[PDB]
Design an enzyme around this catalytic site. Structure first.
Site, PDB file in Angstrom:
ATOM      1  N   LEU A  48     -30.115  56.500  33.444  1.00 52.52           N
ATOM      2  CA  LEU A  48     -31.930  56.021  34.381  1.00 52.52           C
ATOM      3  C   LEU A  48     -32.898  56.713  33.465  1.00 52.52           C
ATOM      4  CD1 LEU A  48     -30.827  55.362  37.805  1.00 52.52           C
ATOM      5  CD2 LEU A  48     -30.576  53.678  36.325  1.00 52.52           C
ATOM      6  N   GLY A  49     -33.881  56.349  33.513  1.00 59.38           N
ATOM      7  CA  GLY A  49     -35.270  56.103  33.500  1.00 59.38           C
ATOM      8  C   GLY A  49     -36.106  57.952  33.020  1.00 59.38           C
ATOM      9  N   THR A  50     -35.297  58.429  33.665  1.00 56.40           N
ATOM     10  CA  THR A  50     -35.256  60.036  33.557  1.00 56.40           C
ATOM     11  C   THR A  50     -36.989  60.724  34.093  1.00 56.40           C
ATOM     12  OG1 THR A  50     -33.384  59.740  32.400  1.00 56.40           O
ATOM     13  CG2 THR A  50     -34.794  62.040  32.397  1.00 56.40           C
ATOM     14  N   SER A  51     -37.843  60.328  33.842  1.00 56.25           N
ATOM     15  CA  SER A  51     -39.590  60.361  34.554  1.00 56.25           C
ATOM     16  C   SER A  51     -39.528  59.765  35.347  1.00 56.25           C
ATOM     17  CB  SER A  51     -39.941  60.321  33.384  1.00 56.25           C
ATOM     18  OG  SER A  51     -41.243  60.763  32.776  1.00 56.25           O
ATOM     19  N   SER A 104     -35.792  64.897  32.911  1.00 58.13           N
ATOM     20  CA  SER A 104     -35.423  65.713  32.016  1.00 58.13           C
ATOM     21  C   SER A 104     -36.361  65.524  30.613  1.00 58.13           C
ATOM     22  CB  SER A 104     -34.288  65.498  31.016  1.00 58.13           C
ATOM     23  OG  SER A 104     -34.197  63.769  30.184  1.00 58.13           O
TER      24      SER A 104
END
Lengths: 204, 242, 245, 212, 205, 245, 233, 198, 222
Positions: free
Chosen positions: E8-11, E138
């Site tokens: 998933l889009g992780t931000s 991340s």
């Protein structure tokens, strides 16, 4: 060791016209040494014939299980087991054991007692049902068997000529094996007589 | 529920269930065992006035527990079958673990424990059958005859009778057999058993079934025919006083 | 309290047998008859159908006749409900034996499992016994024909002719007299049909008020071929004996 | 570790080594090697230490129980089989046992059963267990004689042990000798290898027929 | 054993503003390099005023979240409305006992009318941490400086709306497993307001 | 003797089984406890009866904590009270571990409450027979709850129970009515002592030992504490003042 | 098992004659990212014991919950007993130690290293160690993780033996703990700037200073000015 | 392995089972009956591990013997075989399989014909006139197919088995020290105490 | 996945005497090149005049000794406060060991005390179980160094007076506790020189029929 090709085996089924045909080998080995020319793989339940390829232990265990299921079904219902129905019960018994051992390739052949029409169906260890009315093959040499059958078969065959297709398909498929020698049988099935004919063929 | 008060003492110290159990025994058939000193004879009554049955579909009175261990009973049929199944599992387990063909006493200890078991503790009700377990222990010329009850007691016994006409057969064993000096002949032991069950069955040799066990697996059950020749003989001894 | 709302009746009577068991026997003697005749070239079973009327389907007479095996069948005397539970378990027991030893169940072996459960039903739980008696019809290749009976008391016997359910005394009396061991299937049927008549009081007895089966040697088997008659087949045999009743 | 037991006219000869090591340096000349279950059964240590220890006291509980309850002398035949049957349950649980179940009862005579962690139970006149076993077997076999006197039997046993001691370095702190009789076992002393070596090398003339 | 795995889009973020919290996300599922989903709802209601951003493995986050949803429904009906801290613990418990199979990066952000807006951030392995605002995934390290410096409490809704649209639109550009729609969730006491902006929009704006 | 007095495996014609009705009656012949709700806290007090000089002052305590900020006192049958509390603890701890917060009083109430209801739907499991006055402060205020035998609970603003209930309730409502709810927590301690002292007038064939506690948001800083030292001497002073002395 | 992903680094302690000192930074690290600044890792349990936990924050959170039960349950039955038979360091210690041994023995250990520091109100000063490896010890210096290696030797010049404890005092002790923390923020970059310091005197009870910040600075970089990023064409 | 042979003559089943266990240089045990009598007209011979053999044997004898008394007659070779296979097929799934592969030499005493069965440790069932275990069959199937054809008296079976055993000991490198011969017929189980040309 | 179990040092030495028995052990507890403690013994008096040390890895040790202490307590409770003998203690400690052979374990346990005759006993264990009684027995890290010396000076095996060294021997010494502490003292002092598993302190437990007596000598420190 091998997972099922200790003893090998091959099975072929054809549809004819009022008729079906199922043929198989009679090999038993211990690894590559053929030990016996006799071991029956074809049993039948009511009038639906079940050939099971694979490991000998797994044919035996399934054969006794399918006796158990057919008999109680038969008893409650006062009625025999039907090709169409039998396909589903085989799927359902096999999917439970995809997590267990099993390294089998059964092929079913029959004529329905409820529309008079030919019925064959095929199974793998995975339990993919193969819906077919032309031929269905299973076993170690199944790839080759598909090529032989796809070329040689012609539709709408009567027991004598049907017999000739199957017998030769199986013999020439087997000739490029050793794990399909030691004698072979053809059963040509009508819904009123079953002719069982031993063929003469190679061995090591 | 049903895990309690099936079995408890009275303030009189009788147990309900045991007391009604002994009553099923008096009502039922008659079994007797007389011991030689190199044989054991087991004689049995099977009593039916209705004649439309065979012996080969009516269960036998003497059932084999092993080839050299036999069991006789008086009481309910239903209950006795339960007891018989345990005794065969105990014969084969003993043979397996101790690697000795069976000792007849140990087998009594197992059948008797079960009988004790359903009385002492709830969740099961007691049995209404008494048994005779008899046989030969290996390397013995000396006969073994035991009695076990629904109480679950057991003891070893020189001749013993249970069932209908316990009194009559008792008197006969008191006055014609000794613990001290029994039959020493096989023949005389047969003669005595027939004499005892004949007075009570109130039929010929066609409702007395004799089975003779000589040492370590040697069992022959004499037939109606064979018993009749002694039955004749018996009417002759009795016509010295008639 | 509720530790005294226990019925305490699956304990012994002084009569040498449990309350509930003795009372249950009565219940059987107030439901349908089964008659078992073992012949020297068959086994004949007759049962009189309890309620017969147009509102019922009259073409069904398997309401008490079930085949447990290929060569074993039973006759019911008692209530449908009570029966079904033992029928299903006997059927499985047949299949366990078949599978373990590679051979079909002997008639006494089968009888003996059913009877140990019937006893069981009062022996564990305190629950009530059955209200069914079976008369078993079977062949085994070790004794010839065997015909047995079991009761919810767990006592079983073998007989050459017996009746259970209502009118045991009357039917048994007649059976003992006409019995022979040179009878054939057809001689038995005639016999059976006489006995049934003499226990039923009527103007006439009809073919749909009977449930019939015989287990004969056959002519498609060296085994035994089980023939389950249905009303229209009952009608035929009634002509053949010339015994209209 | 090399242990042998052989069946002869006078009962049973059981002979064993003892040795405990820190390095190849003999830390102690001492350690058990006959586990005296009760006076009628011996089981000899040639397996795992803990495994042998645990099941053989537990075996002592089953013998004691059988005689106390059933009032019957327990056989050697029963002793081995109780043991073998549990062993198969603890098989592939990490078990290492090599023992010989020795007894001499009234009803069987001297009886020696070899029992291993594989669960195998074999009756034999002669069993040698170890890893100096093949060499130990040699000495015994070439001088084997069933009809023998107890004293001469002891000397043959002890030379066999010596033979195995010299070549193989997992035996040879000391020898313990026991002769197992009907009424129980008789200890035949502890013999030092130093003193025992010089006598035999000269005396026996086997592998020593021209002195080496 | 799961065959293949998902991401998933992780931000992800929760930002506090004038009257509550505005919750912001990018959404994108990929299974390898196959774009499993352009758009997604990973803007998850766990209660009517308490939503969350789910990040980490798609299979795992969704499976957890459903369980959290069951506990917080039952929790409301019986024991009264949750808090942000109540929701956060339940999420954590499920991650910690099963951190042998789970990879969940969670921001739970909810509005209460006596705590104002609340951000609780539960990283991988699972531990509850209360912060006045959060950024996670991340891609968050790279915007740490921006976020800290321009983070301001009690900023105008218009100004926060720009700030989230911008914050992510920069993050998404420089990071590579980010992509798809920017969706945002405004939590105040007047209810829940839903924003969606497509790719072509946010890049530009 | 109807099975509405020996079993709860049925519904009654009075909508409750007799034994639960009886639990309610046994709370009232008992010992007096009160609970005073105030605008920032709750105060608890209980009358501990003195029967001998063999008892030790305050080394037997009736007010027992659950958590650290909920105070529980109960009147009625001693064993039943231990068991209720032991349960109360297991819920409270499970809540703190699982949600990472001290438990709300309407929440805590539903958890004990459901357990009192459970033991009142089985025919052989004893009901509870204590009335528990309990409460404390949480993050939306102070709450006073009272739990009954039957599983009945509501929020209270003043509560009273026991032998001296009548008297107690009279003074207690007057003071609560006079005040916004109860005024300060501090004022309420003295008041509380008067009620208990006043209730003791209903039983002068025994002595009492006044025992008070409190749990107040800014007047215990969220905690439940025992009321002792100066604060106990002052409440005594006030009490002996009005009830002459 | 339980593997690093969120870490707390270093808990230090040593004994003086009338008491003990314990200090530990306030840290939730995410590798080398200092993600959470403020995360508690000294829990006062009662009013004469402080639990310092190093290691994984996820697991520390598990010990945190167990402790929250230990404070309620020791007040259970008797809120009359709070310093007599409730909440001693020795009781807190054995409570923790049972969970630790049990979790490791089944081969899924909790990943912490713990110092339960306290001063018994009924005895003498308490300083005892338990870690995930199950290694347990008492000593006049105890330190966890990275601190075990470096902080511990500096603490150890003060007390390392039974004889040195009476020769140590509040001033010596307190200086030593700060000196130790200073060494950890200096050679390890994970350990936080902001720390908390607690001195637990038997006579004056528990004193907990929150928000001390590492001080007596080291501005070492001004020595190495040669340019580092202005690059000339 | 343990070399196990079988030959079915017209009236009987003759089964040949090794008489020795050899440990390096010397025979450690050399009195080895590697077969167990189930019943007076059921015998089963065995190869596999040494320990599996006796543990299975005793378990199986005990079960069969329980069935013999309960049902009051001696169980068929057919009844035993189906039983034997079904237990072996289960064991493979479990932690510990019984790793014994068998030859059941029987007299069907109810229809009067001898039957020989080879059942593998997995469960692979075959009926054969003659069969062998392992590498044995490469060399000895070559002598038995060639020189033997069915309907040959019992003594001819003895001479063939010895020729098979000699070739094995010579040419195959395994060492098993001849055979101890047992014959299963209606007269029971008899030991042939010669092996000199038999 | 993780095995936290490894091994740690320490050294013990058990000697059986005529009328007495000693179990002597160092006070240094180490893990690798760090000092865990300077004063903490792995030897405890477990009571009934049974002294115990389960030397090796600490994690395993502490737990086995907590288990053995509860078991001693319950024996007493159930069996009329009966004396726990060195024979009973021994058996029990095996049952505990074999209970956890399934899991990694790493102690070399040695128990000493007196049997009910008044005769010394020293019993040695492996980390899986099995025991047997020995006349002198070294355990732990320096077992292997201590024992060769110990056999000459206590047991008089491999120890011979001049003349032929083979017919002329030095006999086994009639034991007395005072000369035995000199022997122990010498062993441990030679060990500090060679091993970093030994030092700090030496604790001698002497078990006698006058009770259990503790004797204390210092060992090497900086």
């Amino acid at each position: 060791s091998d997972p099922s090709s200790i003893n090998g085996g091959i099975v072929v089924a054809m549809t004819g016209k009022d008729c079906v045909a199922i043929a198989c080998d009679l090999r038993l080995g211990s690894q590559s040494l053929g030990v016996s020319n006799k071991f029956e793989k074809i049993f039948h339940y009511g009038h639906v014939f079940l050939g099971i390829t694979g490991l000998a232990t797994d044919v035996t265990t399934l054969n006794e299980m399918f006796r158990y299921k057919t008999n109680l079904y038969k008893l409650k219902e006062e009625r025999a087991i039907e090709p169409e129905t039998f396909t589903q019960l085989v799927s359902s018994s096999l999917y439970e054991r995809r997590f267990g051992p099993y390294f089998v390739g059964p092929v079913v052949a029959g004529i329905n007692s409820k529309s008079g029409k030919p019925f064959i169906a095929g199974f793998d260890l995975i339990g993919c049902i193969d819906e077919a009315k032309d031929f269905i093959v299973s076993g170690t040499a199944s790839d080759q068997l598909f090529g032989m059958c796809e070329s040689l078969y012609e539709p709408n065959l009567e027991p004598e000529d049907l017999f000739e297709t199957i017998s030769q398909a199986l013999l020439n498929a087997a000739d490029r094996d050793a794990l399909s020698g030691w004698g072979a049988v053809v059963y040509i099935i009508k819904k009123d007589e079953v002719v069982k004919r031993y063929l003469k063929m190679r061995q090591d | 529920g049903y895990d309690r008060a099936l079995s408890i003492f009275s303030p009189d110290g009788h147990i309900f269930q045991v007391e009604y159990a002994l009553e099923a025994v008096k009502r039922g058939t008659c079994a007797v065992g007389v011991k030689g000193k190199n044989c054991v004879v087991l004689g049995c009554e099977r009593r039916s006035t209705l004649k439309l049955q065979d012996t080969r579909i009516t269960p036998s009175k003497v059932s084999k527990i092993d080839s050299h261990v036999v069991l006789s009973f008086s009481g309910l049929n239903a209950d006795s079958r339960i007891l018989i199944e345990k005794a065969r599992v105990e014969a084969q387990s003993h043979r397996l673990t101790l690697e000795d063909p069976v000792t007849v006493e140990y087998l009594t200890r197992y059948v008797a424990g079960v009988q004790q078991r359903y009385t002492q503790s709830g969740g099961v009700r007691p049995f209404g059958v008494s048994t005779l377990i008899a046989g030969f222990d290996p390397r013995d010329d000396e006969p073994k005859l035991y009695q076990t009850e629904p109480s679950g007691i057991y003891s070893s016994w020189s001749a013993q009778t249970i069932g209908r006409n316990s009194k009559t057969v008792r008197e006969f064993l008191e006055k014609n057999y000794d613990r001290k000096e029994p039959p020493a002949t096989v023949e005389e032991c047969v003669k005595l058993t027939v004499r005892s069950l004949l007075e009570v069955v109130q039929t010929g040799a066609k409702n007395i079934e004799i089975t003779v066990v000589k040492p370590d697996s040697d069992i022959v059950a004499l037939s109606s025919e064979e018993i009749n020749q002694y039955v004749t003989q018996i009417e002759q001894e009795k016509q010295e006083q008639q | 309290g509720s530790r005294r709302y226990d019925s305490r009746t699956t304990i012994f009577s002084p009569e040498g047998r449990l309350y509930q068991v003795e009372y249950a026997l009565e219940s059987i003697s107030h439901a349908g008859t089964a008659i078992g005749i073992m012949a020297s070239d068959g086994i004949v079973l007759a049962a009189e159908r309890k309620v017969t009327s147009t509102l019922l389907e009259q073409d069904t007479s398997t309401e008490k006749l079930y085949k447990l095996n290929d060569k074993i069948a039973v006759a019911v005397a008692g209530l449908t409900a009570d029966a079904e539970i033992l029928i299903n378990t006997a059927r499985i027991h047949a299949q366990n034996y078949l599978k373990t030893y590679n051979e079909d169940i002997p008639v006494e072996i089968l009888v003996r499992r059913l009877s140990d459960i019937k006893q069981g039903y009062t022996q564990h739980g305190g629950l009530r016994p059955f209200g069914v008696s079976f008369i078993y019809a079977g062949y085994d290749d070790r004794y010839g024909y065997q015909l047995y009976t079991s009761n919810p008391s767990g006592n079983y016997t073998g007989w050459k002719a017996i009746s259970v359910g209502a009118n045991t005394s009357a039917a048994q009396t007649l059976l003992q007299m006409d019995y022979k061991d040179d009878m054939k299937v057809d001689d038995a049927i005639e016999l059976a049909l006489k006995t049934l008549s003499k226990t039923t009081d009527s103007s006439a007895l009809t073919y749909d008020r009977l449930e019939f089966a015989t287990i004969r040697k056959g002519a498609n088997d060296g085994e035994v071929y089980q023939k389950i008659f249905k009303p229209q087949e009952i009608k035929d045999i009634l002509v053949k004996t010339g015994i209209t009743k | 570790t090399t242990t042998l037991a052989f069946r002869f006219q006078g009962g049973i000869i059981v002979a064993v080594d003892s040795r405990a090591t820190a390095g190849n340096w003999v830390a102690s000349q001492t350690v058990k090697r006959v586990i005296e279950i009760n006076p009628f059964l011996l089981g000899t240590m040639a397996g795992g230490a803990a495994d042998c220890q645990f099941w053989e006291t537990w075996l002592g509980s089953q013998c004691r129980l059988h005689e106390l309850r059933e009032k019957e002398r327990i056989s050697v035949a029963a002793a081995s089989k109780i043991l073998s049957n549990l062993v198969y349950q603890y098989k592939g649980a990490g078990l290492s046992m090599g023992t010989m179940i020795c007894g001499y009862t009234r009803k069987e005579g001297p009886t020696i059963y070899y029992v291993d962690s594989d669960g195998t139970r074999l009756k034999g006149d002669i069993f040698c267990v170890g890893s100096g076993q093949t060499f130990a077997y040699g000495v015994l076999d070439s001088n084997y004689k069933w009809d023998l006197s107890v004293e001469d039997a002891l000397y043959l046993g002890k030379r066999s042990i010596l033979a195995a001691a010299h070549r193989d370095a997992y035996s040879g702190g000391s020898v313990n000798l026991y002769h197992v009789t009907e009424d129980g076992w008789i200890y035949h002393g502890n013999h030092d290898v130093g003193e025992l070596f010089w006598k035999v090398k000269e005396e026996e003339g086997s592998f020593n027929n021209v002195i080496g | 054993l799961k065959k293949g795995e998902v991401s998933l889009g992780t931000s992800i973020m929760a930002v506090t503003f004038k009257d509550g919290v505005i919750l912001g996300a990018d959404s994108r599922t990929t299974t390898g390099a196959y774009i499993a989903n352009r758009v997604t709802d990973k803007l998850t209601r766990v209660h009517d005023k308490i939503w969350c951003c789910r990040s980490g493995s798609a299979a795992d986050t969704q499976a957890i979240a459903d369980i959290v949803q069951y506990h917080l429904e039952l929790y409301t009906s019986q024991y009264g409305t949750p808090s942000t801290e109540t929701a956060a613990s339940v999420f954590k418990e499920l991650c910690y006992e099963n951190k042998d199979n789970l990879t969940a990066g969670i921001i739970v952000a909810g509005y209460d009318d006596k705590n104002k807006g609340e951000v609780y951030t539960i990283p991988l392995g699972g531990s509850v941490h209360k912060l006045p605002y959060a950024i996670a995934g991340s891609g968050s390290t790279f915007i740490y400086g921006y976020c800290d410096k321009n983070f301001r409490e009690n900023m105008s809704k218009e100004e926060t709306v720009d700030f989230i649209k911008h914050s992510l639109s920069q993050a998404i550009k420089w990071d590579g497993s980010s992509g798809g729609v920017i969706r945002m969730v405004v939590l105040t006491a007047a209810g829940v307001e839903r924003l969606i902006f497509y790719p072509d929009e946010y890049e530009q704006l | 003797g109807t099975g509405y007095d020996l079993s709860n495996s049925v519904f009654s014609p009075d909508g409750r089984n007799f034994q639960v009705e009886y639990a309610v009656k046994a709370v009232e012949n008992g010992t007096t406890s009160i609970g005073i709700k105030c605008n920032d806290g709750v105060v608890f007090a209980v009358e501990k009866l003195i029967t001998s000089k063999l008892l030790v002052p305050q080394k037997n305590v009736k007010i027992q904590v659950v958590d650290r900020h909920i105070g529980c006192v109960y009147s009625g049958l001693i064993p039943d009270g231990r068991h209720l509390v032991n349960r109360g603890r297991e819920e409270a701890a499970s809540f703190k571990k699982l949600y990472k917060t001290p438990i709300p009083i309407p929440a805590f109430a539903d958890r004990l409450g459901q357990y009192v209801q459970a033991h009142t739907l089985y025919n052989s499991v004893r009901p509870f027979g204590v009335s528990t006055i309990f409460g404390g402060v949480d993050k939306n205020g102070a709450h006073l709850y009272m739990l009954e035998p039957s599983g009945s609970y509501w929020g209270y603003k003043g509560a009273a129970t026991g032998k001296g209930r009548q008297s107690a309730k009279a003074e207690l409502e007057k003071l609560v009515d006079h005040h916004p709810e109860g005024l300060s927590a501090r004022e309420a301690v003295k008041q509380a002592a008067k009620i208990i002292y006043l209730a003791h007038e209903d039983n002068k064939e025994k002595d009492f030992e006044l025992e008070i506690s409190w749990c107040s948001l800014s007047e215990t800083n969220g905690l439940h504490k025992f009321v002792k030292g100066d604060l106990l001497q002052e409440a005594i002073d006030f009490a002996q003042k009005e009830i002459n002395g | 098992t339980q593997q690093p992903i969120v870490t707390g680094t270093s808990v230090i302690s040593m004994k003086y004659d009338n008491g003990v000192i314990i200090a530990a930074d306030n840290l939730g690290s995410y590798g080398s990212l200092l993600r959470f600044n403020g995360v508690e890792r000294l829990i006062p349990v009662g009013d004469n014991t402080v639990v310092g936990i190093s290691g994984d924050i996820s697991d520390m959170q598990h010990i945190e919950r167990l402790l929250k039960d230990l404070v309620t349950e020791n007040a259970y039955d008797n809120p009359l007993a709070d310093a007599e038979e409730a909440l001693e360091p020795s009781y807190i210690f054995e409570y923790l130690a049972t969970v630790m041994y049990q979790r490791r023995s089944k081969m899924n250990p909790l990943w912490n290293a713990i110092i339960v520091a306290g001063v018994q109100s009924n005895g003498d000063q308490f300083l005892r160690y338990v870690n995930l490896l199950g290694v347990t010890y008492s000593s006049p210096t105890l330190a966890t993780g990275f601190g075990a290696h470096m902080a511990n030797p500096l603490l150890r010049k003060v007390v390392d033996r039974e004889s040195d404890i009476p020769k140590t005092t509040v001033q010596v002790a307190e200086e030593a703990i700060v000196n130790a923390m200073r060494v950890l923020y200096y050679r390890d970059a994970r350990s936080s700037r902001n720390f908390s310091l607690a001195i637990i005197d038997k006579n004056t009870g528990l004193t907990f200073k929150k928000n001390l910040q590492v001080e007596n600075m080291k501005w070492d970089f001004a020595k190495d000015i040669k340019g580092y990023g202005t690059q000339k064409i | 392995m343990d070399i196990i042979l079988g030959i079915r003559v017209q009236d009987s089943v003759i089964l040949a089972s090794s008489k020795a266990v050899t440990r390096g240089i010397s025979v450690l045990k050399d009195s080895d009956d590697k077969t167990r009598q189930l019943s007076p007209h059921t015998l089963m011979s065995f190869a596999g591990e040494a320990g599996d053999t006796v543990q299975f044997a005793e378990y199986i004898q005990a079960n069969i013997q329980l069935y013999s008394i309960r049902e009051d007659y001696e169980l068929s070779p057919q009844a035993v075989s189906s039983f034997v296979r079904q237990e072996l097929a289960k064991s493979i799934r479990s932690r510990r399989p019984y790793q014994v592969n068998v030859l059941i030499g029987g007299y069907d005493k109810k229809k009067n014909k001898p039957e020989l069965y080879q059942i593998d440790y997995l469960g692979t069932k075959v009926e054969l006139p003659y069969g062998a275990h392992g590498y044995s069959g490469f060399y000895t199937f070559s002598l038995l197919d060639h020189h033997y054809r069915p309907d040959m008296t019992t003594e001819e079976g003895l001479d063939l088995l010895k020729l098979c055993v000699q070739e094995l000991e010579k040419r195959m490198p395994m060492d098993f020290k001849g055979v101890i011969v047992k014959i299963v017929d209606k007269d029971g189980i008899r030991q042939v105490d010669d092996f000199q040309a038999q | 996945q993780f095995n936290p179990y490894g091994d740690n040092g320490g050294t013990i030495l058990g000697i059986a005497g005529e009328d007495f028995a000693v179990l002597a052990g160092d006070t240094r507890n180490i893990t690798d090149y760090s000092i865990n403690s300077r004063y903490e013994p792995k030897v405890f008096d477990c009571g009934d005049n049974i002294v115990m040390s389960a030397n090796g890895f600490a994690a395993d040790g502490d737990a086995l000794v907590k288990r053995f202490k509860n078991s001693v307590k319950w024996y007493h409770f159930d069996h009329n406060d009966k004396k726990l003998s060195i024979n009973s203690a021994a058996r029990n400690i095996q049952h505990l060991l074999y209970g956890k052979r399934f899991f990694p374990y790493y102690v070399h346990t040695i128990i000493a005390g007196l049997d009910e005759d008044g005769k010394g006993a020293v019993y040695s264990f492996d980390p899986v179980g099995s025991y047997e009684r020995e006349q002198c027995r070294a355990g732990g890290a320096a077992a292997s160094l201590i024992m060769p010396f110990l056999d000459n000076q206590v047991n008089f095996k491999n120890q011979y007076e001049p003349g032929t060294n083979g017919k002329v021997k030095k006999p086994l010494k009639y034991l007395s506790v005072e000369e035995v502490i000199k022997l122990v003292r010498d062993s441990f002092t030679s060990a500090t020189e060679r091993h970093i598993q030994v030092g700090d302190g030496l604790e001698i437990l002497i078990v006698t029929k006058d009770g259990v007596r503790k004797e204390f000598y210092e060992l090497k420190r900086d």
